[PDB]
Amino acid sequence: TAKKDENFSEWYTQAIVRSEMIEYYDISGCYIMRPWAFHIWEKVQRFFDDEIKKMGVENSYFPMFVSRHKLEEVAWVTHYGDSPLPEKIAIRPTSETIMYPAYAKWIRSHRDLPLKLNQWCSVVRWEFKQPTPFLRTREFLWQEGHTAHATEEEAWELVLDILELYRRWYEECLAVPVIKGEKSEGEKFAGGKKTTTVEAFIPENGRGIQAATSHLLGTNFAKMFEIEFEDEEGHKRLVHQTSWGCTTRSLGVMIMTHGDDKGLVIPPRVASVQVVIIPILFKDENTGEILGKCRELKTMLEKADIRVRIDDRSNYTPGWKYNHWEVKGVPLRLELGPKDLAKGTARVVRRDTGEAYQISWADLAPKLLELMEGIQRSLFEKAKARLHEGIEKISTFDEVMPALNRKHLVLAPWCEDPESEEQIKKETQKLSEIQAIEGAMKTLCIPFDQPPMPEGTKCFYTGKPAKRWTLWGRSY
Amino acid sequence: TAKKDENFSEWYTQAIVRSEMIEYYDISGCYIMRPWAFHIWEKVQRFFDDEIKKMGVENSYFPMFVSRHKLEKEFSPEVAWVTHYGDSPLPEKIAIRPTSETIMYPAYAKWIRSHRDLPLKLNQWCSVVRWEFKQPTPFLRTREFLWQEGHTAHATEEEAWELVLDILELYRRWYEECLAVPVIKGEKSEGEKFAGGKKTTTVEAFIPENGRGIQAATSHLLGTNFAKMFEIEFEDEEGHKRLVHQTSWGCTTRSLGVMIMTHGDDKGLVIPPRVASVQVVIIPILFKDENTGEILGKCRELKTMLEKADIRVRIDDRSNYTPGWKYNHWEVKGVPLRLELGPKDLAKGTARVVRRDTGEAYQISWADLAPKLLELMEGIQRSLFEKAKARLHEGIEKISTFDEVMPALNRKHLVLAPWCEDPESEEQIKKETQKLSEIMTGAMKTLCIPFDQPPMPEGTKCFYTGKPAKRWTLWGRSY
Ligand SMILES: Cc1cc(N2CC[C@@](C#N)(C3(C)CC3)C2=O)cc(C(=O)NCc2cc(F)cc(-c3cnn(C)c3)c2)n1
Ligand SMILES: Cc1cc(N2CC[C@@](C#N)(C3(C)CC3)C2=O)cc(C(=O)NCc2cc(F)cc(-c3cnn(C)c3)c2)n1
Ligand SMILES: O=C(C[C@H]1NCCC[C@@H]1O)Cn1cnc2cc(Br)c(Cl)cc2c1=O
Ligand SMILES: O=C(C[C@H]1NCCC[C@@H]1O)Cn1cnc2cc(Br)c(Cl)cc2c1=O
Ligand SMILES: [Br-]
Ligand SMILES: [Br-]
Ligand SMILES: [Br-]
Ligand SMILES: [Br-]
Ligand SMILES: [Br-]
Ligand SMILES: [Br-]
Ligand SMILES: [F-]
Ligand SMILES: [F-]
Ligand SMILES: [F-]
């Protein structure tokens, strides 16, 4: 009902509910993840988990509770039954304070390193602001990896390998283009040394959003938690640590990237159902001819590793089913009616473009595989083009507000001084308000891919010598 | 180092710490599950997840919090309550899930409208919290634990019951086929079944060293009781509203504890090959620079060859540990097979292989390695299971009268006794056995009413009440 570009947030809420991905919940900021969405989480989880296992990272499970003093918008447990606890305990917002004392105990010698752990769990961040399903929620599923190394070089190497896996999670599984970069000093994880990130862009509201993160923590947590090892010469040294995480936010980004006015569009690589078979039957009927052929076609397609679901539910019209599965975002629908039975073909409609194909039964499995690769690729390339058109390369501050009013990001030469970022946030916030009467812009990332910087280029805000091209915009 | 048959509890503590399975934590009743334990969990999780997906069960994720009014729709002391965010008190307190019925079933009532929506079959892998102020046991009884909970809804009772039994058979396979732990299928007594369910089925395990039974997993026929409570109804094909027939089932990381206690020995863990992330560890014997490069090369060749046979191999080529250290390390961790390669073996074209369960050593040519190791692993798996099954059979005494109860309990055995199944008699038996044990609770309770029933001769009396016995019932002290 709501059009994606006209009323984006209403479009989003409608799409995630009518698709049967999300059920809203009486406790604000928490959502039920139904199988249509949870299957996508399972797919990217399997991909990422298989890859980090190749790197020697091992899964674990640490408690969801942390004691008050060890933690020093956290949800506090204070009672069991009607009886108060001796001390109140917090639900994890992240697990540094839960894991790193164990790391201190475990690590004694250089022979104990590197230590590489991951866990899949949920965390709780009880912010009072209004939630956004998938993107900003009070409880969410994630994975957090935490490693420790004998040298800075090895930790940094892992940071970048994990960031590349996050690029693949988004770009290869979810067909979402992302930008690799480094966070500004004011936006990085405090208590880390350097934060790398992959950033995505939502064209409909012009907002950047952080997609995943990979931190070079350095030795600051080692000194805080006394994580030391004896080296090959017998001297005590601090470990060099990393941590990295990615959440069900990724599903939200996928939904927003590929959806259209009709509803969701799910990339074939992660879709719970890749091909829905719709028999063209009407109430009663059922002689078995058409459903028999559908079952044959399902078996044949499943032998080619295609995920297939026959919607043989009675008392829905074929058009009702077409719209139902389009709203859910199934990438291909296969229609089988009497005419198709009589000619030995089936009619296949791809979700992203609406293009229809008449395919002989014998040709179904290869053709569908081909179409699937094409849909996946096309979804990514169109989204990549939109990303490129949403970034304006500028040189002076007078170009900022116009570009933000076109719902674009800006790539601008920046001095990288931390005070200027706050200034810029405030100054853009003010200018925005003033227009509004008739909203702040921050750094998203300093991209790894740096265009050339002509000698003597000035920072777009301060006029001081610019160091690097920086990506700015409004953000989630 | 404690011996398993002398101080069982300290043996267990040392076994799970020394093998790097658990780490202690400052919040009582919670433990850290280290990677070595988590590998076994991942194996049984993958097994069970694949099998329920073949049945059409889909995974999902429901919130960890539930509202007061939803939680108490109809145990209360065991629920952890969240009352504050930062320093602000919530308007109303919210609870952490001890189980998810009150969270999922309102959603079921909304989602189910027509027979076209059935069956609805969902599962989730998560953790739950039961805040008992009693002493925990690592894996077996903890305040937070990992589990899966499945919840299904069906148009008919017959279909629901078939699913209950199919899931219970998957739990039998989880314990017996993966973990090599024998279990007994049965039905819970009226006093021990899930309240507000119709029939609870169970698989039960036994710990010989302390004589205790323990529930291994559970599968409930809920019937229509929760459908009434939550108004989960469907319009059948003639437009009449009908109640759904429901099931719920679960199993936890307690399974790992049971595996440890069943197969572990004085040397530490013993991991069944089917759940071992490392089935064969290859130890290069490096000493005085004798043939270092050729030995390492041959180890890598053997690893490739074994992996083509789908054997899970690790080469422990770490230079900062001696070979003898590595032998002990992987023995304490329970790796089923150790492969030793030194210059003597390199010359002979053979390897020395030692199996963890018995310590027997084999000299195996390289060309024979893969089929011989596959044979040895199936032998180890089967032998672990069979020896545990024999201990289970020897731990059960079939009795007729109440006077044989306390002697059998003092032999650390369970009893199989003819029982009237009256629920008051179970409470009376619990209290009386506890009293007699005084002269870790000594009470004896029902473990299950086994599916496999011995003959019941006409006129057999209940071992306690003397009324006519209905069925043979398995009783013991328990976890
Ligand atoms: C799912 C998810 C995901 C993320 N992030 C953060 C970065 C990250 C990435 N990359 C991680 C964690 C991986 C590193 C990611 O995914 C953050 C939140 C969140 O901050 N939740 C609390 C909350 C609740 C709420 F009702 C409202 C707000 C709210 C409203 N306005 N503002 C400004 C906040 C916030 N949640
Ligand atoms: C891991 C786990 C597992 C199980 N169960 C229950 C049945 C089940 C099976 N099969 C499930 C859940 C699958 C159906 C299973 O695995 C129960 C508990 C537990 O009751 N935890 C709380 C607690 C903490 C604690 F510190 C101490 C005690 C305690 C000490 N003495 N007594 C009498 C209690 C209890 N924990
Ligand atoms: O959570 C982090 C840092 C990193 N932890 C490991 C996974 C990847 C992740 O980026 C930063 N962070 C974010 N939000 C937080 C919210 C609260 Br509440 C607390 Cl106490 C602490 C934190 C906190 O430390
Ligand atoms: O948890 C159950 C019933 C079933 N739920 C689904 C998975 C399998 C499981 O056996 C029984 N049970 C057990 N312990 C509980 C503890 C508390 Br606290 C509460 Cl409120 C409720 C319960 C409670 O309902
Ligand atoms: Br994938
Ligand atoms: Br974060
Ligand atoms: Br027909
Ligand atoms: Br004991
Ligand atoms: Br899984
Ligand atoms: Br339970
Ligand atoms: F150092
Ligand atoms: F596995
Ligand atoms: F290896």
**Residues in chain A within 8 Å Cβ distance of B41:** 61
Letter for the amino acid at B403? D
The alpha-helical segments, DSSP class H, found in B112-209 are 157-173
Contact at 8 Å (CB) between B96 and A75?
no
Q: What is the 3-state secondary structure (H, E, C) of A106-174?
A: HCCEHHHCCEEEEEEEEEECCCCCCCECCCECCEEEEEEEEEEECCHHHHHHHHHHHHHHHHHHHHHHC
Q: Which of residues 138-157 of A touch B (CB under 8 A)?
A: 139, 141
List the one residue out of B143, B162, B127 whose CA is nearest residue B80.
B143
List the one residue out of A251, A245, A311, A248 whose CA is nearest residue A275.
A311
Q: Is the Cβ atom of A125 under 6 angstroms away from ligand 1?
A: yes
**Residues in chain B within 8 Å Cβ distance of A28:** none
> A249-258 and A364-389 helices cross at what angle (nearest 10)?
90
Contact at 8 Å (CB) between A474 and A207?
yes
Please state, as a whole number, how many other Cβ atoms lie within 10 Å of the Cβ of residue B74.
7
Letter for the amino acid at A251? L
Residue bearing tokens 């008919």? B156
Helix/strand/coil for A103 = helix
Question: Atom 19, ligand 3: which residue's CA is nearest?
Answer: A93
Letter for the amino acid at A417? D
**Residues in chain B within 8 Å Cβ distance of A117:** 35
User: CA dist B248 to A266, B119, B229, Å?
Assistant: 31, 13, 15
Q: Could you give the angle at the alpha carbon of B3 between the alpha carbons of B2 and B6, nearest 5°?
A: 105
Give chain B's end-to-end CA distance (angstroms, integer). Answer: 25
Mutate to test the interface with A, among B17, B27, B53 (most CBs of A within 10 A): B27
List the one residue out of A218, A232, A96 whose CA is nearest residue A151.
A218
Q: How far apart are CA B224 and CA A472, in angstroms?
A: 57
- β-pairing, B396-398 vs B414-419, is parallel
Q: Dmax over Cα atoms in chain B, in whole Å?
A: 85
Ligand 10 centroid to Cα of residue B434, in Å, is 24
Contact at 8 Å (CB) between A375 and A352?
yes
Q: Which of residues 37-96 of B touch A (CB under 8 A)?
A: 38-39, 41-42, 58-67, 70, 76-86, 93-94, 96
Experimental approach taken: X-ray
Tell me, yes or no, if B362 comes closer than 8 A to chain A by beta carbon.
Answer: no
Ligand 2 centroid to Cα of residue A312, in Å, is 43
Ligand 10 centroid to Cα of residue B478, in Å, is 15
Q: How far apart are CA B180 and CA B137, in angstroms?
A: 21
Q: How far apart are CA B344 and CA A194, in angstroms?
A: 51
**Residues in chain A within 8 Å Cβ distance of B131:** 80-81
Resolution (A): 1.8
> Annotated binding residue at A352?
no
- β-pairing, A391-393 vs A409-414, is parallel
A139 → chain B, closest CA residue: B63
Cβ–Cβ gap B58/A74 under 8 Å? no
Q: How far apart are CA B259 and CA B272, in angstroms?
A: 9
Q: How far apart are CA B463 and CA B467, in angstroms?
A: 9
